[PDB]
mmCIF file of C-alpha atoms and ligand atoms in Angstrom:
data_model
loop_
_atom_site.group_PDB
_atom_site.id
_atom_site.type_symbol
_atom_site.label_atom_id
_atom_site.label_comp_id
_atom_site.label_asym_id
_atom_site.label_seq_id
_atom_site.Cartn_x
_atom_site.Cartn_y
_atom_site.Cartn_z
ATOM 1 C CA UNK I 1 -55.763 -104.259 78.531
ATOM 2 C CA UNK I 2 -59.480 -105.397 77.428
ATOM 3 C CA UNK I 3 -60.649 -109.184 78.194
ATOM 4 C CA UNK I 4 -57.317 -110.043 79.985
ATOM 5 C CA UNK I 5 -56.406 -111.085 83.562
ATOM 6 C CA UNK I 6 -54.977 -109.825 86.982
ATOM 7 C CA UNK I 7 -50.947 -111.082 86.277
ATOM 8 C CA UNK I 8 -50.073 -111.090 89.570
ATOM 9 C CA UNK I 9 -47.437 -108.968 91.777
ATOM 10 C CA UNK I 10 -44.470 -108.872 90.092
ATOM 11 C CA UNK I 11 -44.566 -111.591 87.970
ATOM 12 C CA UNK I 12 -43.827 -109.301 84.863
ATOM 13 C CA UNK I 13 -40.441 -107.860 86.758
ATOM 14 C CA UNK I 14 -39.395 -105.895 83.308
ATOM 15 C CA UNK I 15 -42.639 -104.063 82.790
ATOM 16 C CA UNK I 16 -42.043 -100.187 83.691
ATOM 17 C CA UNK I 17 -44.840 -97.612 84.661
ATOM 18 C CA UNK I 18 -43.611 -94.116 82.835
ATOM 19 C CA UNK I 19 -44.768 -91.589 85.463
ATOM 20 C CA UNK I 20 -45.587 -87.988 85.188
ATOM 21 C CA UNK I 21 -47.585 -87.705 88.438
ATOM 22 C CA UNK I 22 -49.884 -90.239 86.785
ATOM 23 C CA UNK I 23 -48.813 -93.219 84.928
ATOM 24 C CA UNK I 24 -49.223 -92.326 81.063
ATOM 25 C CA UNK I 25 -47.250 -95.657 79.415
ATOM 26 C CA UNK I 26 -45.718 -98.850 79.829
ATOM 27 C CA UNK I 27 -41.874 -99.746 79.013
ATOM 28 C CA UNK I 28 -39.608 -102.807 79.239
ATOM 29 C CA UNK I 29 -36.692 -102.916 81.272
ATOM 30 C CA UNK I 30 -33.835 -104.575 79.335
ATOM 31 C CA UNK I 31 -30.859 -103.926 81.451
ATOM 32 C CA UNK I 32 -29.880 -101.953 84.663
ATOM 33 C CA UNK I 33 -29.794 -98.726 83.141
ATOM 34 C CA UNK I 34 -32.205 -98.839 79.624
ATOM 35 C CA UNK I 35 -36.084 -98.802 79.252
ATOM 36 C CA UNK I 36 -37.459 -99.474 76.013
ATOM 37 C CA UNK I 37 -40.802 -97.852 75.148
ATOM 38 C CA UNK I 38 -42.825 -96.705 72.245
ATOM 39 C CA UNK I 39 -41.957 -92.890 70.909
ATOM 40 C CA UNK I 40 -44.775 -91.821 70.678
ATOM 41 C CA UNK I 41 -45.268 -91.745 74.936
ATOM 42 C CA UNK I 42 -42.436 -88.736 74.800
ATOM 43 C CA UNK I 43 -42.867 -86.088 77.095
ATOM 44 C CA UNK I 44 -40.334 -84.408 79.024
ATOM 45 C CA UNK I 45 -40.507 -84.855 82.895
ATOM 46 C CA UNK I 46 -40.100 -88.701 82.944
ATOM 47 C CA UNK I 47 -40.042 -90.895 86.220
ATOM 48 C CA UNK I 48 -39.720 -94.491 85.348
ATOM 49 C CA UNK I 49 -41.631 -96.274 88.215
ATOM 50 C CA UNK I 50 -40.099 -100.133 88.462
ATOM 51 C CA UNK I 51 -41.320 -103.161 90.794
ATOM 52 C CA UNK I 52 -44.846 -102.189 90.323
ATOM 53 C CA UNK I 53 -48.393 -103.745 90.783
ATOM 54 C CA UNK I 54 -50.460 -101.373 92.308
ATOM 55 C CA UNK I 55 -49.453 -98.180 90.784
ATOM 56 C CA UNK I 56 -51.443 -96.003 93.297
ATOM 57 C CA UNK I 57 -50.069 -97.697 96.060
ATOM 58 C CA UNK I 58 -46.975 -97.990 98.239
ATOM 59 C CA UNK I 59 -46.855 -101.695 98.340
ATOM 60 C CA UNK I 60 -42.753 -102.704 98.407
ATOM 61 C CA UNK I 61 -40.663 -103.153 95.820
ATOM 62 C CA UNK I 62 -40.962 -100.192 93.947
ATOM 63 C CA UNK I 63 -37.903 -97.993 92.880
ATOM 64 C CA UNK I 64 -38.532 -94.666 91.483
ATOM 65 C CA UNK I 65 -36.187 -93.630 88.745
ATOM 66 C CA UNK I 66 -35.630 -90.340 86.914
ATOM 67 C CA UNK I 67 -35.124 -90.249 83.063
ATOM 68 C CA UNK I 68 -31.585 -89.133 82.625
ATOM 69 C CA UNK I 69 -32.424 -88.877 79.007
ATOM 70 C CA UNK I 70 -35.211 -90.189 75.876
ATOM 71 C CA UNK I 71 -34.092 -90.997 72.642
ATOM 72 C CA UNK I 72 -36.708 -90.781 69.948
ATOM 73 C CA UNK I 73 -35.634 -92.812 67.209
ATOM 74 C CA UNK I 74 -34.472 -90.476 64.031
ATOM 75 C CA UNK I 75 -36.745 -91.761 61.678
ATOM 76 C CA UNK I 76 -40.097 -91.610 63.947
ATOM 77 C CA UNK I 77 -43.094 -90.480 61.768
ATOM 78 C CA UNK I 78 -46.010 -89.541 64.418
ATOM 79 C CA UNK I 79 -48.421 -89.321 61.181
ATOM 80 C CA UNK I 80 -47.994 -92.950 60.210
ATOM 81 C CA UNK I 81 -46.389 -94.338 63.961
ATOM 82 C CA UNK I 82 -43.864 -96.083 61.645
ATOM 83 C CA UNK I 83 -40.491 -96.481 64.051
ATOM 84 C CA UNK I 84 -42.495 -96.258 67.162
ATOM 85 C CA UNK I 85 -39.750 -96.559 69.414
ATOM 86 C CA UNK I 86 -37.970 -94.925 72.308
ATOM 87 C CA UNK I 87 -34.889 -95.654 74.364
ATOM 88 C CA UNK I 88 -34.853 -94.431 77.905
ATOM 89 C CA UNK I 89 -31.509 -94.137 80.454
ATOM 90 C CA UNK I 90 -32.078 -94.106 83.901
ATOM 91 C CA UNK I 91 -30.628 -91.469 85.871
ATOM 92 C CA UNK I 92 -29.130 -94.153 88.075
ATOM 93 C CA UNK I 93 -29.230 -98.135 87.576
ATOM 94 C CA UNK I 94 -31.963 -100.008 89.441
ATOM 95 C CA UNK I 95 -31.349 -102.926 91.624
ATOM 96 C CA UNK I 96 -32.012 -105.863 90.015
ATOM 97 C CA UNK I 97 -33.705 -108.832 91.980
ATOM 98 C CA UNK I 98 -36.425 -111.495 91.459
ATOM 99 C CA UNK I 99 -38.983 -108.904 91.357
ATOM 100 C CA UNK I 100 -37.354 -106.085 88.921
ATOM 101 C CA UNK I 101 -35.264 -107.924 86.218
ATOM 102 C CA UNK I 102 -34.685 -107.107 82.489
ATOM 103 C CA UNK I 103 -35.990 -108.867 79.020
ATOM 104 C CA UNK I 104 -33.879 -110.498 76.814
ATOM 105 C CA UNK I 105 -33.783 -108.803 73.128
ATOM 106 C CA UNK I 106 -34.682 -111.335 70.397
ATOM 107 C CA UNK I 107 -31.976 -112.750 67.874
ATOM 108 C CA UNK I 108 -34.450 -113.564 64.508
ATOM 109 C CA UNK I 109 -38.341 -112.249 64.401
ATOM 110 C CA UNK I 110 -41.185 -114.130 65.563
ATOM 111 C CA UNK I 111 -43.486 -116.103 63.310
ATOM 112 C CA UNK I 112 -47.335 -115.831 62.781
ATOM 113 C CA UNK I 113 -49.210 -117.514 65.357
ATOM 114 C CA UNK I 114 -46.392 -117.460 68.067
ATOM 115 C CA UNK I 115 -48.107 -116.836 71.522
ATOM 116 C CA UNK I 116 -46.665 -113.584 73.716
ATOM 117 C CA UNK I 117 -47.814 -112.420 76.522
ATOM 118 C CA UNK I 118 -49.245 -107.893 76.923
ATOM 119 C CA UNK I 119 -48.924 -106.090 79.792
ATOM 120 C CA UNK I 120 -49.888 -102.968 81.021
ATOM 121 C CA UNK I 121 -52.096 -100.289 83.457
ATOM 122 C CA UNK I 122 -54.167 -99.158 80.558
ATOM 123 C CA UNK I 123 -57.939 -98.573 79.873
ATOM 124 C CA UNK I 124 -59.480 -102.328 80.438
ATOM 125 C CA UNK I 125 -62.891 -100.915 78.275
ATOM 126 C CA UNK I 126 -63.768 -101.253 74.802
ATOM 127 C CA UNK I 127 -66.313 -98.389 75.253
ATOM 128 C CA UNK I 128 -65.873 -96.248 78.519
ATOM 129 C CA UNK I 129 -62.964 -96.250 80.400
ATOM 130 C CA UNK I 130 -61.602 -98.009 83.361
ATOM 131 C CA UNK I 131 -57.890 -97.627 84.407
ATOM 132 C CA UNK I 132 -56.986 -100.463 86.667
ATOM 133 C CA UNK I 133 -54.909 -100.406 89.890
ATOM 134 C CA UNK I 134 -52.854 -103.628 89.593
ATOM 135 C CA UNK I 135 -51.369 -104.538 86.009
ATOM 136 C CA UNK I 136 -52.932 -106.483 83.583
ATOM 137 C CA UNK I 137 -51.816 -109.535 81.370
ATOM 138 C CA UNK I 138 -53.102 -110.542 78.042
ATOM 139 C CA UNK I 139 -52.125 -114.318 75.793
ATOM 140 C CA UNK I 140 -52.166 -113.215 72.151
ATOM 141 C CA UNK I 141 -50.658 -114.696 69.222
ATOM 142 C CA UNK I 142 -48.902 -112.717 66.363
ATOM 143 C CA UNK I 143 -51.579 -112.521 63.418
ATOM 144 C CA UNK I 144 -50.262 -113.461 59.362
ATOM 145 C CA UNK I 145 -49.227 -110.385 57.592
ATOM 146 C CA UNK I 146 -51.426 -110.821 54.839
ATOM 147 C CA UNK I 147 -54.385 -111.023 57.472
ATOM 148 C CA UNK I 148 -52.832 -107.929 59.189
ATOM 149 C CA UNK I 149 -52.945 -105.633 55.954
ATOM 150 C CA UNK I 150 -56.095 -106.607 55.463
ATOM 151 C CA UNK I 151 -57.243 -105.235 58.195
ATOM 152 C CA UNK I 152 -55.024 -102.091 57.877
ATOM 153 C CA UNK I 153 -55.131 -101.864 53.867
ATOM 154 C CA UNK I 154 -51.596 -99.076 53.220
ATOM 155 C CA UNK I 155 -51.432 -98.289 56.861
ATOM 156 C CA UNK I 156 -48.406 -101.274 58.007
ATOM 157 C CA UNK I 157 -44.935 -100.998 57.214
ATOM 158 C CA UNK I 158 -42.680 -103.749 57.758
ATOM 159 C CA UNK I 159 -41.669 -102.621 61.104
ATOM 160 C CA UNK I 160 -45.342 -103.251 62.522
ATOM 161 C CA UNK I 161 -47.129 -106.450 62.709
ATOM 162 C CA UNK I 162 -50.346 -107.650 64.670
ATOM 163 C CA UNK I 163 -51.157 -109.392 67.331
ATOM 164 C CA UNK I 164 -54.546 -110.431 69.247
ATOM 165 C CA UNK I 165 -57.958 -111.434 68.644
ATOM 166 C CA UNK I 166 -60.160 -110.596 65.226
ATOM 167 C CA UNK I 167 -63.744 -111.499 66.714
ATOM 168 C CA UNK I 168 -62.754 -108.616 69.046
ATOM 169 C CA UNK I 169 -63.209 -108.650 73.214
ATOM 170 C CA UNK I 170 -59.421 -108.802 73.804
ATOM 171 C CA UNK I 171 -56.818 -106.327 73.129
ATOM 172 C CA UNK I 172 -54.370 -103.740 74.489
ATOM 173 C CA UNK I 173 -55.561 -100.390 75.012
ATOM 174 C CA UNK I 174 -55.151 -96.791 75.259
ATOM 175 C CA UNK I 175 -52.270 -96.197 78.399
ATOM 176 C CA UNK I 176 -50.762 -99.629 77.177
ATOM 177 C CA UNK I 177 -48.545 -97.767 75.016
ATOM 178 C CA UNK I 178 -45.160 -98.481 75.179
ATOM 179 C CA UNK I 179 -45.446 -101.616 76.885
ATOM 180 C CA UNK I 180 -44.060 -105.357 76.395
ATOM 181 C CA UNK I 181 -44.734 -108.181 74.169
ATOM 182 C CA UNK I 182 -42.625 -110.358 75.393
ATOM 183 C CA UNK I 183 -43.074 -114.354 73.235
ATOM 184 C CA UNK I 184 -40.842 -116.820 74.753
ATOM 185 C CA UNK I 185 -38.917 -115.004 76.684
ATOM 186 C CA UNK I 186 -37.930 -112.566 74.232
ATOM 187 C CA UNK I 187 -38.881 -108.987 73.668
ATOM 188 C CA UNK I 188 -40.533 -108.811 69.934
ATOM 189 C CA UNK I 189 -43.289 -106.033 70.379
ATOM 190 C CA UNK I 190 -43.886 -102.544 71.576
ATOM 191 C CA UNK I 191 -47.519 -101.693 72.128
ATOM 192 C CA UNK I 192 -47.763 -99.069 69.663
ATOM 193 C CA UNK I 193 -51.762 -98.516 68.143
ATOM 194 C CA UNK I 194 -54.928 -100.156 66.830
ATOM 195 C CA UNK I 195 -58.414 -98.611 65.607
ATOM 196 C CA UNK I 196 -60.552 -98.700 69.282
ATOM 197 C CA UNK I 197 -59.974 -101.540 71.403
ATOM 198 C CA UNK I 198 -60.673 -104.518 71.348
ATOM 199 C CA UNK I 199 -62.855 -104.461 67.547
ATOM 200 C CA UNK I 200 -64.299 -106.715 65.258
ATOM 201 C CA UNK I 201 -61.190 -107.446 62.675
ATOM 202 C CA UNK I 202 -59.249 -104.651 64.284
ATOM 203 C CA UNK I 203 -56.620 -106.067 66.062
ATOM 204 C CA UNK I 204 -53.331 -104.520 67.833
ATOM 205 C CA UNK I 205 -50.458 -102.959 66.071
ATOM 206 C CA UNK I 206 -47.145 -103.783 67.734
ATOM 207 C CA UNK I 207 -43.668 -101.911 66.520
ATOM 208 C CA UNK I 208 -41.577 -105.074 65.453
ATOM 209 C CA UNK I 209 -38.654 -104.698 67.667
ATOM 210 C CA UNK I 210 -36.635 -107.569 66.018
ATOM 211 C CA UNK I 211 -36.016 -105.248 63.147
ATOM 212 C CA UNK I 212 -33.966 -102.651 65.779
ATOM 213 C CA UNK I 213 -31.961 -104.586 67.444
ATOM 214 C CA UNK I 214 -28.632 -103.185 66.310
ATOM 215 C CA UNK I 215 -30.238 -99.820 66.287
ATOM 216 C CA UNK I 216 -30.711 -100.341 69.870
ATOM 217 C CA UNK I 217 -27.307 -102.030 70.256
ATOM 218 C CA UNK I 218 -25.449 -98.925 68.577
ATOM 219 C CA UNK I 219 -27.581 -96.533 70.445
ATOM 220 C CA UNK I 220 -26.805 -97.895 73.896
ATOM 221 C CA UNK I 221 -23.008 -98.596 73.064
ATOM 222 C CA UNK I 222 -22.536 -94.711 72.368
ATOM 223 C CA UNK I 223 -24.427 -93.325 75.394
HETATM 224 C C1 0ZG G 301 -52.640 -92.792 64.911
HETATM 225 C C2 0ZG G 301 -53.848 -93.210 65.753
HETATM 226 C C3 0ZG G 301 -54.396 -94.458 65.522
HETATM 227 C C4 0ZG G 301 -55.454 -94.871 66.294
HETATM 228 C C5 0ZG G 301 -55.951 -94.044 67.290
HETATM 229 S S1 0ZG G 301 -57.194 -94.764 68.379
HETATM 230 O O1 0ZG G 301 -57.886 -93.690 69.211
HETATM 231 O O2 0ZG G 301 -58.150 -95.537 67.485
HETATM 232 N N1 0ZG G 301 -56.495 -95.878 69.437
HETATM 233 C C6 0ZG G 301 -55.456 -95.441 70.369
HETATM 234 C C7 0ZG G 301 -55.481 -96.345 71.615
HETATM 235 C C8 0ZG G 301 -54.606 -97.604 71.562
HETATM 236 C C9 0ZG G 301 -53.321 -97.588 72.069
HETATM 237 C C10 0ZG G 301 -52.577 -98.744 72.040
HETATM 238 C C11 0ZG G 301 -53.078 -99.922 71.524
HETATM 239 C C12 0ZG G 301 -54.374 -99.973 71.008
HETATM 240 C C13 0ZG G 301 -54.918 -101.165 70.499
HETATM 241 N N2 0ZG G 301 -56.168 -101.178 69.996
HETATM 242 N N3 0ZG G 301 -54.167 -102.281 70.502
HETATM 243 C C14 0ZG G 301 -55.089 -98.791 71.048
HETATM 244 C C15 0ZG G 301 -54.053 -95.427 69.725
HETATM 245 O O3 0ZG G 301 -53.803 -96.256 68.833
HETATM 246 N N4 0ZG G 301 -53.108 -94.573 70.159
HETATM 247 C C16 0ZG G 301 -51.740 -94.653 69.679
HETATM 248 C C17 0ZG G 301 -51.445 -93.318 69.055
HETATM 249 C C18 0ZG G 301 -51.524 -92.315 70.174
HETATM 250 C C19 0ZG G 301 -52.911 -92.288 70.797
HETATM 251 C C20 0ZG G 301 -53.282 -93.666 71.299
HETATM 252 C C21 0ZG G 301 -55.436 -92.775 67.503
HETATM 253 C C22 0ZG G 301 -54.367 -92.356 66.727
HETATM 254 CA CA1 CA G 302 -47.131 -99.452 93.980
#
């Protein structure tokens, strides 16, 4: 996350580390057994990694959880990163408690300029790299469409919108993938891609999750 904050142990309890002996993306807890996350952070060899702050150290709280399976959605174009979205079981439900606790799905879409807040262990540079320890937060508001596909002329669909900061300096990031944005209290983003980080009238691109929430329904009811 560029230009955000330290959030504070465990006071995002549904944001997931996805762990392959280093973490590689964020996902969103939304029940005892499912992790939503973006599709393009499939790999095989998956151990969610729940209860986290400090991801390189043993700190309490933490339960270690092997993907059981991933579900890609169907329709998941990695040219265009149109359905960028991935359901994860857990080989075994987690314990849930006031520091590891799910997000509520949304019931309609948000609107422009609704405030969320981003999560996530990724690269805190717009121009080198720096991974961060303990996980950081981010306040952005959902952008206007029209001023999203102007800054992305023929590259959203509707199952994208934007979200952030168009004089640049704050942003999600590369290993932020996957992760939540979660706007009152609801679950209505997946961090999915931008151009850089953090750029001048380049701002985040977030899979619209309130379009997929019978898809996720359906999925979840038949496995
Ligand atoms: C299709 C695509 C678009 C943009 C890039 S990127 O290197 O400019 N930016 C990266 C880093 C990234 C990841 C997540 C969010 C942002 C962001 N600027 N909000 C940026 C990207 O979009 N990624 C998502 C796709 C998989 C690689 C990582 C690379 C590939
Ligand atoms: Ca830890």
């Amino acid at each position: 996350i560029v230009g955000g904050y330290t959030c504070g142990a465990n006071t995002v309890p549904y944001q997931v580390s996805l762990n392959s002996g280093y973490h590689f993306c964020g996902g969103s807890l939304i029940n005892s057994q499912w992790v939503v996350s973006a599709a393009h952070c499939y790999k095989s060899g998956i151990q969610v990694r729940l209860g986290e702050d400090n991801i390189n150290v043993v700190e309490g709280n933490e339960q270690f959880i092997s993907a059981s399976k991933s579900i890609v959605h169907p329709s998941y174009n990695s040219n265009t990163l149109n359905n960028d979205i991935m359901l994860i079981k857990l080989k075994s439900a987690a314990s849930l408690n006031s520091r590891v606790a799910s997000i509520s799905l949304p019931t309609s879409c948000a609107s422009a300029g609704t405030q969320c807040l981003i999560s996530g262990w990724g690269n805190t540079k717009s121009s080198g790299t720096s991974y961060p320890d303990v996980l950081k937060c981010l306040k952005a508001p959902i952008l206007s469409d029209s001023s999203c596909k102007s800054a992305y002329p023929g590259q959203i669909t509707s199952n994208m919108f934007c979200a952030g900061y168009l004089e640049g300096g704050k942003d999600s990031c590369q290993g932020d993938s996957g992760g939540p944005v979660v706007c009152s209290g609801k679950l209505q983003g997946i961090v999915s891609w931008g151009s850089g980080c953090a750029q001048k009238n380049k701002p985040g691109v977030y899979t619209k999750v309130c379009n997929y929430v019978s898809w996720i329904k359906q999925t979840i009811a038949s496995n």
